[PDB]
PDB file of all heavy atoms in Angstrom:
ATOM      1  N   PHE A 306     107.981 107.183 -30.743  1.00  0.00           N
ATOM      2  CA  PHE A 306     106.971 108.116 -31.217  1.00  0.00           C
ATOM      3  C   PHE A 306     106.642 107.844 -32.683  1.00  0.00           C
ATOM      4  O   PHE A 306     105.488 107.953 -33.099  1.00  0.00           O
ATOM      5  CB  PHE A 306     107.451 109.560 -31.048  1.00  0.00           C
ATOM      6  CG  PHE A 306     106.429 110.578 -31.458  1.00  0.00           C
ATOM      7  CD1 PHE A 306     105.197 110.642 -30.810  1.00  0.00           C
ATOM      8  CD2 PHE A 306     106.682 111.453 -32.511  1.00  0.00           C
ATOM      9  CE1 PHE A 306     104.229 111.560 -31.207  1.00  0.00           C
ATOM     10  CE2 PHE A 306     105.719 112.376 -32.914  1.00  0.00           C
ATOM     11  CZ  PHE A 306     104.491 112.429 -32.261  1.00  0.00           C
ATOM     12  N   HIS A 316      98.794 112.384 -37.295  1.00  0.00           N
ATOM     13  CA  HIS A 316      99.171 113.356 -38.310  1.00  0.00           C
ATOM     14  C   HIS A 316      98.070 113.603 -39.333  1.00  0.00           C
ATOM     15  O   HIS A 316      97.985 114.689 -39.908  1.00  0.00           O
ATOM     16  CB  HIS A 316     100.478 112.940 -38.995  1.00  0.00           C
ATOM     17  CG  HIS A 316     101.701 113.324 -38.220  1.00  0.00           C
ATOM     18  ND1 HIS A 316     102.980 113.141 -38.697  1.00  0.00           N
ATOM     19  CD2 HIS A 316     101.833 113.902 -37.001  1.00  0.00           C
ATOM     20  CE1 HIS A 316     103.849 113.589 -37.807  1.00  0.00           C
ATOM     21  NE2 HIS A 316     103.178 114.055 -36.769  1.00  0.00           N
ATOM     22  N   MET A 319      95.788 116.051 -37.630  1.00  0.00           N
ATOM     23  CA  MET A 319      96.388 117.374 -37.702  1.00  0.00           C
ATOM     24  C   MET A 319      96.265 117.933 -39.112  1.00  0.00           C
ATOM     25  O   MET A 319      95.959 119.108 -39.291  1.00  0.00           O
ATOM     26  CB  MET A 319      97.854 117.308 -37.291  1.00  0.00           C
ATOM     27  CG  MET A 319      98.050 117.070 -35.803  1.00  0.00           C
ATOM     28  SD  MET A 319      99.785 116.960 -35.393  1.00  0.00           S
ATOM     29  CE  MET A 319      99.691 116.454 -33.660  1.00  0.00           C
ATOM     30  N   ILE A 346     108.332 125.123 -32.113  1.00  0.00           N
ATOM     31  CA  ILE A 346     108.936 124.592 -30.900  1.00  0.00           C
ATOM     32  C   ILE A 346     108.656 123.098 -30.894  1.00  0.00           C
ATOM     33  O   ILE A 346     107.496 122.684 -30.933  1.00  0.00           O
ATOM     34  CB  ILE A 346     108.325 125.227 -29.630  1.00  0.00           C
ATOM     35  CG1 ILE A 346     108.375 126.762 -29.712  1.00  0.00           C
ATOM     36  CG2 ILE A 346     109.073 124.713 -28.397  1.00  0.00           C
ATOM     37  CD1 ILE A 346     109.780 127.357 -29.767  1.00  0.00           C
ATOM     38  N   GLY A 347     109.715 122.292 -30.863  1.00  0.00           N
ATOM     39  CA  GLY A 347     109.543 120.848 -30.873  1.00  0.00           C
ATOM     40  C   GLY A 347     108.995 120.357 -32.203  1.00  0.00           C
ATOM     41  O   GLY A 347     108.189 119.426 -32.248  1.00  0.00           O
ATOM     42  N   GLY A 348     109.441 120.980 -33.290  1.00  0.00           N
ATOM     43  CA  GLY A 348     108.979 120.613 -34.619  1.00  0.00           C
ATOM     44  C   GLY A 348     109.242 119.179 -35.058  1.00  0.00           C
ATOM     45  O   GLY A 348     108.705 118.738 -36.072  1.00  0.00           O
ATOM     46  N   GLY A 349     110.080 118.456 -34.322  1.00  0.00           N
ATOM     47  CA  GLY A 349     110.354 117.068 -34.660  1.00  0.00           C
ATOM     48  C   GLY A 349     110.889 116.816 -36.060  1.00  0.00           C
ATOM     49  O   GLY A 349     111.855 117.449 -36.477  1.00  0.00           O
ATOM     50  N   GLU A 352     107.062 117.076 -40.618  1.00  0.00           N
ATOM     51  CA  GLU A 352     105.874 116.849 -41.446  1.00  0.00           C
ATOM     52  C   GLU A 352     104.784 117.899 -41.236  1.00  0.00           C
ATOM     53  O   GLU A 352     104.304 118.510 -42.195  1.00  0.00           O
ATOM     54  CB  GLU A 352     105.281 115.461 -41.187  1.00  0.00           C
ATOM     55  CG  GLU A 352     106.248 114.309 -41.373  1.00  0.00           C
ATOM     56  CD  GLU A 352     106.971 113.934 -40.085  1.00  0.00           C
ATOM     57  OE1 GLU A 352     106.882 114.689 -39.092  1.00  0.00           O
ATOM     58  OE2 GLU A 352     107.633 112.876 -40.074  1.00  0.00           O
ATOM     59  N   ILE A 353     104.386 118.108 -39.985  1.00  0.00           N
ATOM     60  CA  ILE A 353     103.343 119.084 -39.682  1.00  0.00           C
ATOM     61  C   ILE A 353     103.830 120.502 -39.963  1.00  0.00           C
ATOM     62  O   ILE A 353     103.088 121.324 -40.495  1.00  0.00           O
ATOM     63  CB  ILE A 353     102.880 118.977 -38.207  1.00  0.00           C
ATOM     64  CG1 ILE A 353     102.362 117.561 -37.932  1.00  0.00           C
ATOM     65  CG2 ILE A 353     101.758 119.982 -37.928  1.00  0.00           C
ATOM     66  CD1 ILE A 353     101.255 117.125 -38.888  1.00  0.00           C
ATOM     67  N   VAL A 375     113.045 125.038 -32.943  1.00  0.00           N
ATOM     68  CA  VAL A 375     113.723 124.778 -31.681  1.00  0.00           C
ATOM     69  C   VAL A 375     113.422 123.307 -31.422  1.00  0.00           C
ATOM     70  O   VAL A 375     112.311 122.950 -31.028  1.00  0.00           O
ATOM     71  CB  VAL A 375     113.152 125.633 -30.527  1.00  0.00           C
ATOM     72  CG1 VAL A 375     113.818 125.236 -29.210  1.00  0.00           C
ATOM     73  CG2 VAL A 375     113.389 127.104 -30.813  1.00  0.00           C
ATOM     74  N   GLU A 376     114.415 122.459 -31.670  1.00  0.00           N
ATOM     75  CA  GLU A 376     114.264 121.021 -31.524  1.00  0.00           C
ATOM     76  C   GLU A 376     115.559 120.447 -30.938  1.00  0.00           C
ATOM     77  O   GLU A 376     116.620 120.534 -31.560  1.00  0.00           O
ATOM     78  CB  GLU A 376     113.953 120.434 -32.918  1.00  0.00           C
ATOM     79  CG  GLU A 376     113.959 118.929 -33.025  1.00  0.00           C
ATOM     80  CD  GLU A 376     113.034 118.260 -32.034  1.00  0.00           C
ATOM     81  OE1 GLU A 376     111.807 118.505 -32.080  1.00  0.00           O
ATOM     82  OE2 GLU A 376     113.554 117.491 -31.205  1.00  0.00           O
ATOM     83  N   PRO A 377     115.491 119.859 -29.734  1.00  0.00           N
ATOM     84  CA  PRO A 377     116.670 119.288 -29.073  1.00  0.00           C
ATOM     85  C   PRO A 377     117.216 117.965 -29.614  1.00  0.00           C
ATOM     86  O   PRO A 377     118.358 117.605 -29.333  1.00  0.00           O
ATOM     87  CB  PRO A 377     116.233 119.180 -27.616  1.00  0.00           C
ATOM     88  CG  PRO A 377     114.775 118.822 -27.750  1.00  0.00           C
ATOM     89  CD  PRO A 377     114.305 119.773 -28.851  1.00  0.00           C
ATOM     90  N   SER A 378     116.407 117.253 -30.387  1.00  0.00           N
ATOM     91  CA  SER A 378     116.822 115.966 -30.950  1.00  0.00           C
ATOM     92  C   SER A 378     117.556 116.072 -32.286  1.00  0.00           C
ATOM     93  O   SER A 378     116.994 116.537 -33.279  1.00  0.00           O
ATOM     94  CB  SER A 378     115.607 115.057 -31.135  1.00  0.00           C
ATOM     95  OG  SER A 378     115.959 113.884 -31.842  1.00  0.00           O
ATOM     96  N   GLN A 381     115.770 114.057 -34.867  1.00  0.00           N
ATOM     97  CA  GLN A 381     114.599 114.727 -35.422  1.00  0.00           C
ATOM     98  C   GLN A 381     115.040 115.772 -36.452  1.00  0.00           C
ATOM     99  O   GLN A 381     114.485 115.850 -37.548  1.00  0.00           O
ATOM    100  CB  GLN A 381     113.794 115.403 -34.305  1.00  0.00           C
ATOM    101  CG  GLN A 381     113.039 114.431 -33.371  1.00  0.00           C
ATOM    102  CD  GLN A 381     111.888 113.724 -34.064  1.00  0.00           C
ATOM    103  OE1 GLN A 381     112.088 112.993 -35.030  1.00  0.00           O
ATOM    104  NE2 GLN A 381     110.669 113.945 -33.572  1.00  0.00           N
ATOM    105  N   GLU A 405     118.182 122.679 -29.361  1.00  0.00           N
ATOM    106  CA  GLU A 405     118.063 123.085 -27.970  1.00  0.00           C
ATOM    107  C   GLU A 405     116.604 122.932 -27.559  1.00  0.00           C
ATOM    108  O   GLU A 405     115.733 122.745 -28.406  1.00  0.00           O
ATOM    109  CB  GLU A 405     118.512 124.546 -27.808  1.00  0.00           C
ATOM    110  CG  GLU A 405     117.545 125.570 -28.408  1.00  0.00           C
ATOM    111  CD  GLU A 405     118.103 126.990 -28.420  1.00  0.00           C
ATOM    112  OE1 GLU A 405     118.825 127.367 -27.477  1.00  0.00           O
ATOM    113  OE2 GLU A 405     117.802 127.739 -29.369  1.00  0.00           O
ATOM    114  N   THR A 406     116.349 122.994 -26.258  1.00  0.00           N
ATOM    115  CA  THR A 406     114.994 122.878 -25.735  1.00  0.00           C
ATOM    116  C   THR A 406     114.372 124.274 -25.724  1.00  0.00           C
ATOM    117  O   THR A 406     115.069 125.272 -25.900  1.00  0.00           O
ATOM    118  CB  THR A 406     115.008 122.347 -24.291  1.00  0.00           C
ATOM    119  OG1 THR A 406     115.719 123.274 -23.465  1.00  0.00           O
ATOM    120  CG2 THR A 406     115.697 120.990 -24.225  1.00  0.00           C
ATOM    121  N   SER A 407     113.063 124.354 -25.513  1.00  0.00           N
ATOM    122  CA  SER A 407     112.407 125.657 -25.490  1.00  0.00           C
ATOM    123  C   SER A 407     112.914 126.493 -24.322  1.00  0.00           C
ATOM    124  O   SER A 407     112.986 127.716 -24.413  1.00  0.00           O
ATOM    125  CB  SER A 407     110.885 125.500 -25.383  1.00  0.00           C
ATOM    126  OG  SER A 407     110.521 124.935 -24.142  1.00  0.00           O
ATOM    127  N   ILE A 429     103.573 121.830 -30.934  1.00  0.00           N
ATOM    128  CA  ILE A 429     102.737 120.682 -31.224  1.00  0.00           C
ATOM    129  C   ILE A 429     103.195 119.390 -30.589  1.00  0.00           C
ATOM    130  O   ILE A 429     104.267 118.865 -30.907  1.00  0.00           O
ATOM    131  CB  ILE A 429     102.616 120.530 -32.758  1.00  0.00           C
ATOM    132  CG1 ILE A 429     102.040 121.837 -33.330  1.00  0.00           C
ATOM    133  CG2 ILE A 429     101.731 119.333 -33.124  1.00  0.00           C
ATOM    134  CD1 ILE A 429     101.979 121.903 -34.846  1.00  0.00           C
ATOM    135  N   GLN A 430     102.362 118.887 -29.679  1.00  0.00           N
ATOM    136  CA  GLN A 430     102.633 117.637 -28.982  1.00  0.00           C
ATOM    137  C   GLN A 430     103.982 117.631 -28.282  1.00  0.00           C
ATOM    138  O   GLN A 430     104.690 116.620 -28.290  1.00  0.00           O
ATOM    139  CB  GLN A 430     102.558 116.475 -29.973  1.00  0.00           C
ATOM    140  CG  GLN A 430     101.147 116.147 -30.420  1.00  0.00           C
ATOM    141  CD  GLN A 430     100.339 115.483 -29.312  1.00  0.00           C
ATOM    142  OE1 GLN A 430     100.090 116.080 -28.274  1.00  0.00           O
ATOM    143  NE2 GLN A 430      99.936 114.240 -29.535  1.00  0.00           N
ATOM    144  N   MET A 431     104.331 118.746 -27.650  1.00  0.00           N
ATOM    145  CA  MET A 431     105.615 118.817 -26.973  1.00  0.00           C
ATOM    146  C   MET A 431     105.602 119.430 -25.579  1.00  0.00           C
ATOM    147  O   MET A 431     106.592 119.330 -24.861  1.00  0.00           O
ATOM    148  CB  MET A 431     106.628 119.556 -27.858  1.00  0.00           C
ATOM    149  CG  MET A 431     106.272 121.000 -28.207  1.00  0.00           C
ATOM    150  SD  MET A 431     106.427 122.149 -26.832  1.00  0.00           S
ATOM    151  CE  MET A 431     108.145 121.928 -26.389  1.00  0.00           C
ATOM    152  N   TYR A 434     106.931 117.775 -22.341  1.00  0.00           N
ATOM    153  CA  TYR A 434     108.348 117.726 -22.004  1.00  0.00           C
ATOM    154  C   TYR A 434     108.931 119.023 -21.470  1.00  0.00           C
ATOM    155  O   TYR A 434     110.141 119.148 -21.314  1.00  0.00           O
ATOM    156  CB  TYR A 434     109.117 117.261 -23.235  1.00  0.00           C
ATOM    157  CG  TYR A 434     108.375 116.151 -23.943  1.00  0.00           C
ATOM    158  CD1 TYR A 434     107.913 116.310 -25.248  1.00  0.00           C
ATOM    159  CD2 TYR A 434     108.079 114.960 -23.278  1.00  0.00           C
ATOM    160  CE1 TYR A 434     107.169 115.308 -25.870  1.00  0.00           C
ATOM    161  CE2 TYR A 434     107.342 113.961 -23.887  1.00  0.00           C
ATOM    162  CZ  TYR A 434     106.890 114.136 -25.178  1.00  0.00           C
ATOM    163  OH  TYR A 434     106.160 113.131 -25.767  1.00  0.00           O
ATOM    164  N   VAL A 435     108.062 119.981 -21.181  1.00  0.00           N
ATOM    165  CA  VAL A 435     108.503 121.264 -20.652  1.00  0.00           C
ATOM    166  C   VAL A 435     108.368 121.224 -19.138  1.00  0.00           C
ATOM    167  O   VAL A 435     107.364 120.744 -18.611  1.00  0.00           O
ATOM    168  CB  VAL A 435     107.645 122.412 -21.227  1.00  0.00           C
ATOM    169  CG1 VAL A 435     107.938 123.705 -20.501  1.00  0.00           C
ATOM    170  CG2 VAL A 435     107.941 122.563 -22.711  1.00  0.00           C
TER     171      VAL A 435
HETATM  172  N1  SAH B 656     111.953 120.842 -23.823  1.00  0.00           N
HETATM  173  C1  SAH B 656     111.729 120.719 -25.153  1.00  0.00           C
HETATM  174  N2  SAH B 656     111.713 121.890 -25.943  1.00  0.00           N
HETATM  175  C2  SAH B 656     111.476 121.777 -27.287  1.00  0.00           C
HETATM  176  N3  SAH B 656     111.236 120.600 -27.964  1.00  0.00           N
HETATM  177  C3  SAH B 656     111.264 119.459 -27.141  1.00  0.00           C
HETATM  178  C4  SAH B 656     111.504 119.423 -25.746  1.00  0.00           C
HETATM  179  N4  SAH B 656     111.467 118.154 -25.268  1.00  0.00           N
HETATM  180  C5  SAH B 656     111.217 117.398 -26.269  1.00  0.00           C
HETATM  181  N5  SAH B 656     111.076 118.163 -27.474  1.00  0.00           N
HETATM  182  C6  SAH B 656     110.750 117.684 -28.816  1.00  0.00           C
HETATM  183  O1  SAH B 656     109.364 117.603 -28.751  1.00  0.00           O
HETATM  184  C7  SAH B 656     109.009 116.772 -29.835  1.00  0.00           C
HETATM  185  C8  SAH B 656     107.828 115.934 -29.356  1.00  0.00           C
HETATM  186  S1  SAH B 656     107.150 114.802 -30.619  1.00  0.00           S
HETATM  187  C9  SAH B 656     106.962 116.168 -31.798  1.00  0.00           C
HETATM  188  C10 SAH B 656     106.319 115.898 -32.921  1.00  0.00           C
HETATM  189  C11 SAH B 656     106.073 117.039 -33.897  1.00  0.00           C
HETATM  190  N6  SAH B 656     105.791 118.421 -33.214  1.00  0.00           N
HETATM  191  C12 SAH B 656     104.868 116.491 -34.586  1.00  0.00           C
HETATM  192  O2  SAH B 656     103.779 116.723 -33.937  1.00  0.00           O
HETATM  193  O3  SAH B 656     105.011 115.499 -35.350  1.00  0.00           O
HETATM  194  C13 SAH B 656     110.249 115.889 -30.275  1.00  0.00           C
HETATM  195  O4  SAH B 656     110.730 116.154 -31.605  1.00  0.00           O
HETATM  196  C14 SAH B 656     111.194 116.269 -29.193  1.00  0.00           C
HETATM  197  O5  SAH B 656     112.536 116.076 -29.424  1.00  0.00           O
END
Side-chain angles (χ1 to χ4, degrees):
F306 183 61
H316 278 185
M319 288 178 188
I346 307 297
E352 305 91 349
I353 302 305
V375 175
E376 171 55 61
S378 172
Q381 289 291 61
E405 71 189 324
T406 62
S407 66
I429 303 175
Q430 288 288 63
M431 61 72 58
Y434 319 118
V435 170

